[PDB]
């Protein structure tokens, strides 16, 4: 079965009953919020639907809280969507109003008092571009120059304008709260520009006593401009290709994506690759060709994860949508499961010996590879090298089983917390043995560390076959 | 600037004025004559158009005549399309009909004969699918298990069922004809599924007295096989996704495609990537994350060349859709032009040869590798290789000229037959200090070969500063 | 420390008082003992001094008994030494006599029997060489080609005749007996053929009760021809290069050496280098530059051990002879440990956790490596591929820690028997902290394995802290 | 056949009768002749006896000069020597005296001056060796620490003590002066310490109006640390073995000599391995497995040539000496040809194209290569490669064959000087099929380049046939 992970995003399309059921029953491994739609009632739903769903099935899914962030948007139109022709005249108006085809607000406030004539106006990720000829008062006078359809609360991107918003609004600090109280497992930002970002994420979850792994969502030049020094200070990231597309030059995305990747892989960190991969599936219930190559290169490139959105919040053809990807994704693995190799030997304990766990399994064949962690980052070390053989964690903390949901190649197990390496190694055999999959005799390697329950303290290598008395 | 090759197809949207020199300024490499569709008086008109732009802006085209082969299609209904949704009774039948929404002819006349209750039925690449539920006389009664709109003549594919028919039929046998008459410069053959295929094709081109280089288009199974047979039979290959994407699971074909490119410049036989790589600039004026990506991901593949279909033959964007593909491909070139690398040294003496002229012209920081070739051989023996140098073929024969716009890399020069490969190399400044962009000095390394004007001849390298008396 | 081992041959120059000590002092990690020259007594006293050394310094000295073998030789002469001039004809008979310079007996009595006109005759690896004329009857006429003095019982060889042998002579399985009872740690057999030779060493071992490792001799095609063979039957080789420069063309010697030394590193057997390495300082206080080299080059080949022979055994200058190869060993060390590398990944379990237990410590910038070993196998995989890192092996066999001063790098901590791993890890500590070079808190890698007692139970590495509380 | 070039001492055992020539048969292709011994006219005779031998033979052989340079020695004895036992008082003074056993003379008047309690004095590269106790007015007072004979003029070393003295002294310039006029090929000056060494030796050749290749012998720290400026100021250099392992430590010289011959490999510089290769053969009719092992080593190292010293100059065995010699590399060159690779891409003209040139010659198994040179340094760039082919240069300087003789793997071919590259090849055809080893057909890889009769103007690859029409 299948090694690289899949987020799906809800919506709409999966609120009707046992459909989150569907979804995890079909592979979804992380569901996602995104707080810029939905109310508090619909989040805490959803939320409850995988907490059942994943229990009765017995397959780990993390739930992750995607918050909107500075995301500049559009008002209402009236009819609740029109179309912008090629050749049309278009106010975006920072004043109230009824909006319409000719005139619509946006939530950016200093548009009419920061745009200048000649900026480019991207809607909807370039569903529409629209060139700025005017300013007069509060409405910023500008011209169809590609045509599409537009609807109520659409993003606006304004490349190069450099836009004054907080990193979190007062709205994001408030839906973090609500998402950390409700129990999610992991949280993403939206338009990360700067390392000490996470700070900002941090000093909330602190006042509120609970944390847990932030995503950095890339989607801002200043972010690829920072990118090594955001994967050191954020958990995990995403390819967050929709507004990257139009927040630089969508023909650099391809290897910013390849890239930023690269980057995860090398430090441990979960990445996502995120947005149109399987995009005409919302209307179709079979992709294009360009969409079934973008998925398997994203399996090539090494993603951990890679993310539907539209494709299940809003669309015709959810389920397909997921068991679509999972397919590629297999085809893909069932040929090699390499991935770019890393352009360091790794440095820390926990890489050196996950690093050396790895050789010994594939080289004796071993049935899998069992890892014991108490944040992840074991774990994490050997699932970004990629390897055929199972990788099974072992885990006394139930979120990180939800966390590792996103990271390549796993399947976690929980475990009471153990007082020592013998310990750790019982409950191995216990567990495996009550699956199908593995019986007495089976060769495994199991990493673990002492003194136990104490992260970081990774240190033993353990060759074994299951039941037998070799420890 | 450009490197990677692009391929068009003429179509309805470029029957509009002036468009195929737009698509030329743009910068087509290659037009495709797509002889499913269209009168001769078509065809006639839009080679025409074509040759004007070429000669008319100095940029080499190839002109190449994709032959229908095979293709099984729905015939027509009774207002030119319809609607075929989920739940459905259609029949699609062999004998006589009124075509219309419940039941529409075939071109191919035993599929009574040759289908089974179960049978899938694909229609226009996978926009809709049926399934056969029997065979009443001549009807095939299915239902619509995915739907999607149907209109004339779209193609059906039946993934299990053992098709008959003639590599090439009559029709194909009489279009071949009439394009090696109007004088185009290759030949597409569509399903290819045996390397005897191309013999079939060279029968009729000697009963007419010309040959042109041959392109196995690749959209069967029997054809991937068959897949190195069929490169060492044909001059080219083509992968031909929409069909092939049918024809075989489409999450196989991404893996396909790389090994087929690969297999491509491993015997230095063109390869062009066909067919929904922008699918969505058919309706819009900008492509998908999933599109640029496939786009960025056919350069590192390798191939010479990437095609658009209804990008540029029926689309509204079809000028934007060539800017776009070009500007990716740039993005990713301006990155690296490195390509995988062939799986063995080079043993031919043209592939030894030019292999060891891109090593000389790198090593010194040459302005450019120029190569003479007569049959096109020597040059695409060095542009498989990749190289960010120029690649300038020379050649006494403009067809040449014209194959080679399909190579990966290469500009090509027509110039007199010479009877030294000094002359040659005397030309060689002639031509080059014709261009504003070159002086005298320049560091260039030449390939020819002696006895002059013999195929397979190459047996020389020479390093030259322009201009200098170093001969 | 020095990582290459050194092999010493006793003899007439290190009968002397406190001298034996002296050699261990220097270095002298074996002492061979020749069965080829001295009385019982002889060996009897020898080996008790070399004990006292070893064990009165703290330095492994393993001693290896050499068993003389099939050596064919010369009787006596009358006057017990001749010259013979280059252009005298000389009988070797196989006729019983006293000899004379114009006829002298052998102790093979099928010479004549299996001599040919042509055959040449190397004695005393070759310092005069004859030319087979013809065989009358018992005698081997042959015309002195190359001339020297001869003396009593020299050694003679015929290069490429098929000599017929028991691969241990009844002199041989006595002087095997005695040094099977004086208690030796490991036994050589001269003039190996067949891999088949050791069954006849075992099968005396077993009469007499007592094992121990088994060196093979290489000197003879046959056993060149069959050099995995024989690798892999005894547990050892020696590159016997006197005898084999005669029993080959001599041309052919170094790079035998290098694929012998190459085959027992790919199977983890020790290898020794012998003869001649600093034939001069027998006479002279300083070698030649060509020994010097042929020593560094020994090392640069990856050789367990290298052998001085008659620069200890007869020489003047032993202590010299002993320090001299200890400094060019250790100046190619300080540069260097690096080895050609093995031409497979390594597949036994105790092979990829050494390899694996070596990455992990030089990764970790660990202040040693350590291995549990109970045959030495387990230390032997670790040895053969270098490592700047100390290796300290443990063992609760003594005999082992002798063994394994032959092998590469290799000190050795002999503890008690232990009932766990945790046990085997707490006596590293003390064992490692008697030692001034040693501290609390120093990092350590340590392989081991359960169940504990058993050969090729190793499966565990352990990342230690000495004296901390990380099991 | 042999590849490595072999150069021999001249001396007392080769001025017997028709030795010059047998030598010269048996493949010696450097003369070496040693300005420390013979009078003027010794070497003439033994200069005339080598062109002849060179000249009725048809194998070139380089003729080089090697000049004693600053050469410290011991004065004369009254009896012409004394005896140096271990523990006796030993004073060496700069006034000048017949010498005794208690007192004797040296050349070098700073001796009282530079030398330091502490320093040794090792005499007759190391036979003797004394520790300097004090200075007294002129007297270096010692105390012999390992004895020996020594007699009249004995070279002595100071390692590490900083010697003043001109690079060449009166007596050198003169030697040089009579060997440029006598006709030699090549000058080795002894003693090099700086690359401005080679300044003075032309200073010396322009004077007199006639420069020859230099080659700095290496056998000074000074040179050691200096050894890349060195390479690249002389034109080769020679591994001095005899006099660096009593310079430096001994043991440091085996890695001394291996970087020396990488550094020469890298800058396209001959290299000669120097001294006590087969030492004992000076007495013995073989050599020690050392000496087989060292000699092979040299030949793997990548060493252009190996010297023999006493070997030829005053050994029983000369003759047998140089065939040893050969049948030693032959058997290494019979397994394999390839050489340390370099560590760069070669970035100069010539050595690109040279290295090109043998790609294309090894994978077409082109019978040979070919390269035109009028300095040599096309065919060295080529020569350090290494390949199994024959690289037979081509010249119309009769010099640059006796220079080539030094270079690895290269037969030369003389030719009259062409105005054309075509000329060139005609050339070499006609003088290749007056050889047994090409016949009209045979494959061969011609470097040549115009303008022709220019240094450094290499610029041409050609594949030819023999004899057939391809150029
Ligand atoms: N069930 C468990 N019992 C004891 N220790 C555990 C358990 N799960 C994880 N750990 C500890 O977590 C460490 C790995 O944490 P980490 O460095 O975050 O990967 C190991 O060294 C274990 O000591
Ligand atoms: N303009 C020309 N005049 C004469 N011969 C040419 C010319 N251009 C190319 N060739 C020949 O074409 C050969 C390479 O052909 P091919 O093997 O088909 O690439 C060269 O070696 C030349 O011998
Ligand atoms: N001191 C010891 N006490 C008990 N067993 C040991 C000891 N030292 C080594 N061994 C055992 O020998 C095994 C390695 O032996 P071998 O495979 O022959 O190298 C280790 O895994 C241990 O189980
Ligand atoms: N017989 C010759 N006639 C003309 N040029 C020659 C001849 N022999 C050697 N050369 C030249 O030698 C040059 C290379 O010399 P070098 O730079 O020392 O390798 C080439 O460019 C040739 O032109
Ligand atoms: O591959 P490694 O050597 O374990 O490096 C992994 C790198 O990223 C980690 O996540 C840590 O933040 C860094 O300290 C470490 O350097
Ligand atoms: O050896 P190369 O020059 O790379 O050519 C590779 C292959 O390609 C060509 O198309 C030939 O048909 C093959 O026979 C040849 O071996
Ligand atoms: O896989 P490795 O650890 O290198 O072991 C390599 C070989 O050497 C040992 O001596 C065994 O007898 C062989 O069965 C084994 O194949
Ligand atoms: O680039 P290559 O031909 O290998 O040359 C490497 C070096 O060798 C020569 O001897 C030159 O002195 C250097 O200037 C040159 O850089
Ligand atoms: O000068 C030499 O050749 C030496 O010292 O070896
Ligand atoms: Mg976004
Ligand atoms: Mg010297």
């Known amino acids: 079965t299948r090694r690289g992970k899949i987020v799906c995003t809800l919506g709409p399309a999966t609120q009707r009953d046992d459909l989150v059921r569907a979804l995890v029953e079909a592979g979804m491994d992380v569901a996602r919020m995104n707080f810029s739609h939905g109310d508090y009632d619909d989040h805490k739903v959803a939320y409850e639907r995988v907490r059942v769903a994943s229990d009765a099935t017995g397959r780990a899914v993390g739930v992750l809280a995607d918050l909107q962030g500075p995301k500049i948007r559009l008002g209402r139109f009236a009819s609740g969507a029109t179309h912008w022709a090629e050749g049309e005249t278009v106010r975006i108006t920072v004043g109230a109003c009824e909006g319409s085809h000719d005139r619509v607000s946006t939530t950016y406030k200093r548009l009419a008092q920061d745009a200048v004539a000649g900026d480019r106006v991207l809607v909807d990720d370039g569903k529409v571009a629209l060139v700025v000829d005017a300013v007069e008062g509060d409405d910023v006078v500008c011209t169809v120059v590609e045509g599409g359809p537009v609807s109520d609360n659409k993003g606006i991107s ?7 918003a907080p990193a979190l ?13 409700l129990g999610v497992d992991m949280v993403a930002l939206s338009f990360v520009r700067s390392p000490a970002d996470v700070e900002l994420v941090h000093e909330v979850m602190d006042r509120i006593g609970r944390r847990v792994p932030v995503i950095a969502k890339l989607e801002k030049p200043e972010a690829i401009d920072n990118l090594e020094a955001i994967v050191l200070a954020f958990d995990a990231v995403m390819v967050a290709r929709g507004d990257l597309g139009v927040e630089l030059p969508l ?3 391809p290897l910013v994506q390849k890239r930023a990747i690269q980057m995860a892989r090398e430090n441990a960190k979960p990445v996502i690759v995120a947005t149109q ?17 973008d998925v398997a290169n994203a399996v090539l490139d090494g ?4 993310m539907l959105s539209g494709e299940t919040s809003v669309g015709k053809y959810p389920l397909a949508a997921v068991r679509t990807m999972s397919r590629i994704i297999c085809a893909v693995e069932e040929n090699s499961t390499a991935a770019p190799p890393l352009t360091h030997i790794p440095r820390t304990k926990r890489g050196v010996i996950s690093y050396a766990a790895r050789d010994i399994g594939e080289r004796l064949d071993a049935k899998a590879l069992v890892a014991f962690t108490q944040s992840g980052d074991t774990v994490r070390r050997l699932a970004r090298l990629h390897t055929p053989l199972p990788l099974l964690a072992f885990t006394a903390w139930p979120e990180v089983r939800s966390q590792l949901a996103m990271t390549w190649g796993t399947e976690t197990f929980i475990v009471p917390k153990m007082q020592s390496t013998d310990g750790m190694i019982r409950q191995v055999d216990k567990s495996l043995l009550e699956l199908a999959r593995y019986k007495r005799g089976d060769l495994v390697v199991i990493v673990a560390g ?5 992260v970081g303290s990774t240190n033993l290598i353990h060759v074994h076959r299951i039941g037998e008395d070799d420890v």
């Open 450 to 454: 002492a003194p136990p329950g104490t």
């Open 303 to 306: 993603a951990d994860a890679l």
């Open 277 to 293: 991969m399987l995009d005409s599936m919302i209307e179709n219930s079979r992709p294009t060709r360009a969409e079934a190559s």
């Open 169 to 181: 609004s007062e709205k994001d600090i408030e839906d973090l709260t609500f998402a950390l109280n």
């Open 158 to 164: 304004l490349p190069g304008m450099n836009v004054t």
């Open 251 to 253: 023909e650099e995305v």
